[PDB]
């Protein structure tokens, strides 16, 4: 807190910057717990106040029910709230939220198979499609394609995509059959 106050009130001090680079780690550790607000002080000047935020308070604030309460409060203030009553309504909301989070802290005491089946179906069907290409015995077709034939090569080019489409159909059928097995 001392270092943060000094750095913020002396924003262009290289000597203090050196201390900041000496003390990233402590500042990084204490970053979530360092509260920072600005107030109009007794000297008719805007002053910045540093305080401690507790981990339990932060978790209670971050719980979704409090977030929904905050959203409702903000909606109400923006739509049907004035400027004179704004900071009184905000303080009332803060008090209610603080009491609720304290009560929550007090009361607190100190698909997967369907995805696996889809992955298995993908692996199995794609491996079946890989076996035909990796057979290594394609010498029987280099037999017929020893001489360049536009028609033959176009036919093989289409046949590869037809095989891919058939493999996709098999994968889809397997995914269904697995889903029926899982649900029943």
């Amino acid at each position: 807190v001392l270092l943060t106050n000094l750095s913020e009130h002396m924003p262009n001090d290289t000597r203090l910057q050196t201390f900041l680079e000496l003390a990233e780690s402590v500042l990084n550790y204490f970053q979530p717990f360092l509260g920072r607000i600005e107030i109009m002080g007794s000297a008719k000047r805007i002053e910045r106040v540093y305080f401690e935020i507790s981990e339990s308070s932060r978790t209670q604030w971050e719980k979704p029910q409090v977030k929904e309460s905050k959203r409702q409060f903000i909606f109400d203030v923006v739509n049907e709230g004035g400027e004179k009553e704004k900071m009184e309504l905000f303080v009332n909301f803060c008090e209610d939220t603080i009491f609720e989070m304290q009560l929550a802290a007090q009361i607190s005491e100190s698909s997967i198979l369907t995805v696996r089946s889809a992955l298995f179906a993908l692996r199995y069907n794609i491996l079946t499609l890989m076996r035909m290409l990796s057979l290594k015995s394609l010498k029987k077709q280099m037999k017929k394609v020893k001489k360049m034939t536009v028609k033959d090569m176009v036919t093989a080019f289409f046949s590869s995509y037809w095989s891919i489409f058939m493999t996709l159909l098999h994968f889809v059928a397997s995914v269904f059959r697995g889903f029926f097995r899982i649900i029943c």
Binding site: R123, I126, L129, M130, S134, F165, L168, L169, V172
Partner: peptide, 21 residues
């Protein structure tokens, strides 16, 4: 082989390719 296997998995999981199939 392994990269082509992964590529075909991605293509099969693609929505537009499934629609065209």
């Amino acid at each position: 082989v392994k990269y082509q296997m992964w590529k075909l998995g991605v293509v099969f999981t693609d929505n537009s390719f499934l629609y065209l199939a």
